[PDB]
Design an enzyme around this catalytic site. Structure first.
Site, mmCIF file in Angstrom:
data_model
loop_
_atom_site.group_PDB
_atom_site.id
_atom_site.type_symbol
_atom_site.label_atom_id
_atom_site.label_comp_id
_atom_site.label_asym_id
_atom_site.label_seq_id
_atom_site.Cartn_x
_atom_site.Cartn_y
_atom_site.Cartn_z
ATOM 1 N N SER A 42 97.205 49.552 28.512
ATOM 2 C CA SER A 42 96.703 50.904 28.809
ATOM 3 C C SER A 42 97.583 51.761 29.720
ATOM 4 O O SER A 42 97.252 52.937 29.916
ATOM 5 C CB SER A 42 95.305 50.822 29.426
ATOM 6 N N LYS A 206 97.606 54.065 36.968
ATOM 7 C CA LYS A 206 97.001 53.717 35.680
ATOM 8 C C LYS A 206 97.239 52.243 35.429
ATOM 9 O O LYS A 206 98.393 51.798 35.420
ATOM 10 C CB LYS A 206 97.600 54.530 34.545
#
Length: 262
Positions: A42, A206
Site C-alpha cells: 500500500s 503511508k
C-alpha cells in the site's frame, strides 16, 4: 554509522531490510539496500493520490467529482468505501480514505479514474522515476513474491519520488500541501515509524503490508527547527511476526532520530 546500524538491525529483522533517508537540508542521502527492489504494497497509494492531484492541477480532474460504485466493486480492506455504496464518494474523499485508512476499493476506484496500473507507472516515468512500477490492482498487488519485479520500488527511488511530489514542485502548492495533510492524518502507522519519533516531530506516512512477511512505511518528517527528511523503509521475507516487523520499522525511526539529533 546509521548505515552500519541498519545492517545490524536487519540481522534482528528476520528478513531483507531496505531504507533510504533523504535530508532536504543538505540533499544528502543515506541508504541501506537502497537500490534493491522491494514490494510496495500500500505504499503505492501515496503515489496514486499524487497522480490524481496532478490531474487536478492540469484541470483534468476535480476533487469534488462524485464517483459511484456497487457492492461488487468492493474488495477486502475497504472500511470507508463499504459504507458509501449508496451515495458514492468524491475524488477527495477516496484519496483521503486510500491514504489515511489504506482503503483498497478507494485505491482501485482512483486507479480506474487514472487509467489503471500502467497509467500510474507512466506518471511516475514522466516525473523521472525510472524504477517504480505498478502492475496489478488491489488486492493481488500485495503478493510480494520474492524475485517478482511486479509492483515494486527501491527505497532510494521511492525517497526521491516522494521528495519531488511532496516537497518539490511536481505538484501545485495546494496539491502538495493536501497530500502532505492526508499523510499527516494517517491512522495506520502508529506502530511503525511514528512509534520511533518524539512527539513534536511532525510526520506524514503511508504504510504497506503484504505477503511474504512484508511490512513497509514511507514518511516525510519535520524535526523541530529544520528542513524535512524523507524516510523510506521496506522489510520483506521477514520471519518475525507482524508486531515485531512493526517494531523493526519503529527502530529505524529511533535510529534516524539519533542520527539527526543526538
Amino acid at each position: 554509522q546509521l548505515s552500519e546500524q541498519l545492517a545490524e538491525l536487519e540481522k534482528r529483522s528476520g528478513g531483507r531490510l531496505g531504507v533510504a533517508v533523504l535530508d532536504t537540508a543538505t540533499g544528502r542521502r543515506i541508504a541501506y539496500r537502497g537500490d534493491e527492489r522491494f514490494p510496495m504494497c500500500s505504499t503505492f497509494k501515496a503515489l496514486l493520490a499524487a497522480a490524481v492531484l496532478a490531474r487536478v492541477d492540469q484541470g483534468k480532474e476535480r476533487l469534488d467529482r462524485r464517483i459511484t460504485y456497487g457492492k461488487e466493486d468492493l474488495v477486502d480492506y475497504s472500511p470507508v468505501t463499504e459504507k458509501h455504496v449508496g451515495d458514492g464518494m468524491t475524488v477527495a474523499e477516496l484519496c483521503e480514505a486510500a491514504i489515511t485508512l489504506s482503503d483498497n476499493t478507494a485505491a482501485n476506484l482512483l486507479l480506474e479514474a487514472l487509467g489503471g496500473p500502467a497509467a500510474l507507472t507512466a506518471f511516475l516515468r514522466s516525473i523521472g522515476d525510472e524504477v517504480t512500477r505498478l502492475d496489478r490492482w488491489e488486492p493481488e498487488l500485495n503478493e510480494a513474491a520474492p524475485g517478482d519485479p511486479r509492483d515494486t520500488t527501491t527505497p532510494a527511488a521511492m525517497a526521491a519520488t516522494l521528495r519531488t511530489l511532496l516537497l518539490g514542485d511536481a505538484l501545485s502548492p495546494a496539491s502538495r500541501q493536501q497530500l502532505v495533510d492526508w499523510l499527516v492524518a494517517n491512522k495506520t502507522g502508529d506502530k511503525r515509524l511514528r512509534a520511533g519519533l518524539p512527539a513534536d516531530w511532525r510526520v506524514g506516512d503511508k504504510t504497506g503490508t503484504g505477503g511474504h512477511g512484508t511490512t513497509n512505511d514511507i514518511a516525510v518528517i519535520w524535526p523541530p527547527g529544520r528542513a524535512p527528511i524523507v524516510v523510506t523503509v521496506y522489510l520483506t521475507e521477514s520471519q518475525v511476526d507482524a508486531d515485531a516487523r512493526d517494531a523493526v520499522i519503529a527502530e529505524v525511526g529511533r535510529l534516524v532520530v539519533e542520527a539527526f539529533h543526538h
